[PDB]
Amino acid sequence: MQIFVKTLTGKTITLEVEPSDTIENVKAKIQDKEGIPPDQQALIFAGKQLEDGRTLSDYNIQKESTLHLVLRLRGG
């Protein structure tokens, strides 16, 4: 299974994932590819933010789904 996480800067990140993958380790694989630390990652699927600990199949993210990634950090 492969999915795409699209960003605001314009990059399209392609990831090989399994349906049982967690959101933590989708963020971990996003980090290995583009070097964005997972603590700054907010991943959205069909308008819903994805939560660490739940799986890709929990959100019904299937083959060739597109996720959305925005940087979100505390101020200061």
């Binding site: 960003t7 605001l8 800067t9 907010a42 959205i44 069909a46 308008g47 933010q49 959305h68 990634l69 925005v70 940087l71 979100r72 950090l73 505390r74 101020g75 200061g76």
Partner: protein, 828 residues
């Protein structure tokens, strides 16, 4: 029956701007080759080759066609019936695709001029304009066809409009817009101005109606100001001879004071046809007062000032000769920028006209109840022990759920936030401990409950001082939907099935979050913010027709002010409450609501007057959400000026963009009764004066009369025997009378008896004479009786009457006598 526009605009469309660029580059910017006024002109040192019929003129005619279609659509929505073309359509039915083609044609309508010769070579000039249009299409066939022009048949239709071989200026929407756009630009400073304005007003009026036509020509003057063209005044009482514009002629009044008509209708008279003794040209003021003119023109009796309001004549003229005039006539992007700004302002100026003006952009000062609300907030935070499952119990007062919903509804919680301090922020940790196990519920019913204080301790909070707490709290709101969905719904009073603690936390965190945002935000206030929402199909169509009704009844005007109707419809259809009462999340990047979150509803929120005071949320790095928070002031409305169909969301549902303008007015101020917070605060501070209550009960105590009576018995039995000399004498003569008088003074309550028996009590030196054990026992008892008499003598004769006199002076509000009563106590 009016289809939603798609946001097509002369000022953002690229094809239209490209055609104007090519028109300038290849014709409008090149010198005239003919005779009549071919010589260039300078404005601030910059050459203009075609002063009248050049770039600026051509761009204005396209801008006219835009507003004419705009106002035609508004007029249809208001229920007006517009003039129809043969196919049954009116100008209100013009599509975006059709308006683009019309504008492209307009861009070339004058490119064929060899000079400013008017009558002599109409057809040569119009054929050369046509050929220029054909040349441009041919050179851009690949881009132009079929996307803009469907085929060569389509191109020839618009080429035929430019050529204008038969003067069929009412044949189609393209004919009317091209012809009227060209004509609207002829309203200028030629005299008499009243004749020109009435004429071109009458040409346009049948197609779009009087209200629309007033809007078009009012906007024209603004387009003239934006492009540095002179604007004439209008004087309905001008006695200069009227000008029949169609023919540049005159009407005549005969030997009797009658207009010469025909077998009626007014005789056209050539200007060179000099006439009879005592015959007269009809004046402007007579023409405008004709019944036929008053029924088709609302200018009678009215006056318009020329030039620019606020500029003296000497300054209007140095403005007209500024270098910006040459920039308008040679720079397509600058001139479109000038026109776009004027066009946008004509959508705001009518809105402000319909309401009481306001001068101050800042939030108002705190009111009595917000001050009390802040203090109650501070004291809850200081002592979280007061928080119960059902209520808050503080200083004897019980605050239930409705009290906190009332604060959410009636106080400006940003103002309340401005009254909180850094230790209230610091107490958030204490509050979260006390609420460690309080479970919050997302409005998303599939989401699981989240323990507020534990999640704050273990996930949200990151240590540090006050500023870091502020950023953490802002992060909680930006990041955790289980929390901000519940908070937002409660704050806007649209929640269902909330717990008391969810309401209370909403009422505490809303001002605390506002303070955190105000204390930390440093970004300059942006003037275009975007807000995404996911609305039901039924709710959005209510908003669409609410916004279209407001827009359709907001029009510029020349002589007829319809502000009253704009006020009525804006109050009937206002949906500012959708963005009110909470820390509303916005972004400067429309792609955050549109793409990331897939909203079907986007509010484009414009704040040109700086009334929203938005505050930066989080980080603004590339790839962030570029988030800002607004807490809407109580007197600011977000008034729609535009609705655009924007395509489909990811899930296939239509997406619409509502463009809202923030407008401040006392007419938007809500009416709330006072005391909702001051009431409970005052009860909390009523003093329990237990020190005075104890004073009262010390005046309660009873004297020990039995003890005085019994001591009399002992003195007598102590006396019956001589022992120490001559303490028996002393007992009978000094001690026994004093005890007899004391008892009689205390049996009654004779302060006067009690006062002077005090002086009769023997001195300690008198007792020094007797050293027996029973004599020393006696003085100790005697000192006790003296203390009992003295306490009653001072309380009943000094202290209590002084307090009573003081209070009677306070009861007559003579405060000087009140303090007198205490300070002026006389000794016994």
């Amino acid at each position: 029956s009016v289809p939603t526009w798609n946001g097509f605009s002369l000022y953002t469309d690229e094809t239209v701007r490209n055609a104007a660029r090519y028109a300038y580059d290849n014709y409008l910017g090149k010198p005239y080759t003919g005779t009549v006024e071919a010589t260039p002109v300078n404005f601030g040192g910059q050459m203009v080759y075609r002063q009248h019929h050049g770039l600026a003129h051509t761009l204005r005619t396209m801008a006219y066609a835009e507003i004419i279609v705009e106002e035609a659509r508004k007029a249809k929505l208001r229920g007006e019936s517009l003039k129809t073309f043969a196919d049954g359509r009116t100008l209100a039915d013009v599509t975006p695709e059709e308006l683009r083609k019309i504008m492209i044609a307009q861009a070339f309508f004058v490119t064929g001029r060899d000079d400013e010769e008017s009558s002599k070579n109409y057809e040569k000039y119009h054929e050369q304009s046509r050929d220029a249009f054909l040349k441009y299409v041919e050179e851009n066939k690949s881009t132009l066809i079929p996307d803009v022009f469907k085929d060569e048949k389509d191109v020839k239709f618009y080429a035929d409009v430019i050529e204008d071989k038969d003067h069929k200026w009412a044949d189609s929407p393209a004919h009317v817009l091209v012809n009227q756009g060209h004509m609207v630009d002829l309203v200028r400073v030629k005299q008499p101005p009243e004749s020109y304005l009435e004429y071109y007003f009458s040409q346009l009026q049948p197609w779009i109606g009087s209200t629309a036509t007033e809007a078009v020509f009012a906007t024209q003057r603004q387009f003239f100001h934006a492009t540095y063209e002179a604007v004439a005044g209008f004087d309905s009482e001008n006695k200069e001879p009227h000008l029949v514009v169609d023919g540049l002629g005159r009407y005549v009044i005969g030997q009797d004071g009658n207009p010469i008509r025909e077998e009626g209708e007014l005789k056209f008279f050539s200007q060179k046809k000099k006439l009879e003794e005592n015959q007269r040209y009809m004046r402007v003021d007579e023409y405008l007062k004709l019944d036929e003119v008053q029924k088709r023109f609302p200018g009678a009796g009215k006056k318009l000032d020329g030039g620019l309001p606020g500029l003296k004549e000497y300054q209007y003229l140095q403005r007209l000769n500024s270098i910006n005039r040459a920039r308008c006539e040679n720079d397509v992007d600058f001139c479109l920028g000038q026109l776009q700004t004027a066009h946008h302002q004509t959508k705001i100026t009518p809105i402000k006209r319909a309401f009481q003006s306001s001068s101050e952009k800042a939030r108002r000062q705190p009111n009595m109840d917000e001050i009390a609300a802040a203090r109650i907030v501070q004291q809850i935070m200081a002592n979280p022990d007061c928080i119960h499952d059902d209520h808050v119990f503080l200083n004897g007062q019980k605050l239930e759920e409705k009290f906190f919903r009332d604060l959410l509804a009636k106080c400006d919680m940003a103002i309340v936030g401005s009254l909180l301090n850094d230790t209230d922020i610091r107490n958030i940790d204490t509050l979260m401990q006390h609420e460690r196990n309080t479970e919050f519920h997302s409005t998303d019913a599939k989401a699981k409950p989240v323990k507020l204080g534990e999640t704050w301790e273990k996930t949200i909070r990151s240590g540090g001082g006050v500023t870091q707490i502020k950023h953490d709290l802002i992060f909680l709101m930006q990041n955790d939907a289980w929390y901000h969905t519940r908070v937002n719904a409660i704050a806007q009073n649209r929640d269902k099935d909330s717990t008391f603690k969810e309401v209370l936390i909403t009422a505490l965190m809303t001002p605390l979050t506002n303070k955190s945002l105000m204390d930390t935000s440093r970004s300059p206030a942006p003037k275009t913010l975007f807000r995404g929402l996911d609305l039901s199909e039924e709710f959005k169509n209510k908003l669409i027709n609410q916004a279209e009704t407001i827009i359709a009844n907001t029009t510029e005007h020349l002589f007829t002010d319809l502000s009253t109707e704009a006020f009525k419809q804006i109050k009937l259809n206002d949906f500012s409450q959708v963005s009110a009462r909470t820390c509303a999340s916005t972004s400067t990047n429309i792609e955050v609501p549109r793409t990331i979150f897939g909203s079907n509803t986007i509010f484009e929120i414009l704040d040109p007057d700086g009334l929203l005071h938005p505050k930066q949320v989080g980080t603004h790095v590339s790839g962030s959400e570029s988030e800002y928070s607004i807490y809407l002031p109580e007197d600011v409305a977000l008034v729609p000026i535009k609705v655009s169909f924007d395509g489909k969301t990811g899930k296939g549902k239509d997406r619409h963009i509502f463009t809202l303008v923030a407008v401040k007015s006392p007419d938007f101020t809500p009416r709330h009764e006072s005391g909702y917070a001051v009431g409970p605060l005052l009860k909390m501070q009523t003093p329990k004066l237990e020190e005075i209550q104890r004073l009262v009960e010390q005046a309660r105590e009873e004297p020990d009369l039995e003890r005085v009576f019994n001591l009399q018995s002992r003195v007598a039995r102590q006396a019956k025997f001589s022992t120490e000399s001559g303490y028996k004498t002393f007992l009978n003569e000094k001690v026994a009378p004093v005890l007899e008088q004391s008892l009689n003074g205390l049996l009654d309550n004779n302060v006067t008896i009690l006062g002077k028996v005090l002086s009769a009590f023997p001195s300690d030196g008198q007792w020094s004479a007797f050293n027996s054990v029973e004599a020393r026992q006696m003085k100790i008892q005697m000192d006790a009786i003296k203390q009992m008499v003295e306490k009653k003598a001072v309380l009943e004769g000094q202290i209590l009457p002084a307090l009573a006199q003081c209070q009677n002076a306070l009861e007559k509000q003579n405060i000087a006598g009140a303090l007198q009563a205490l300070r002026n106590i006389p000794s016994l």
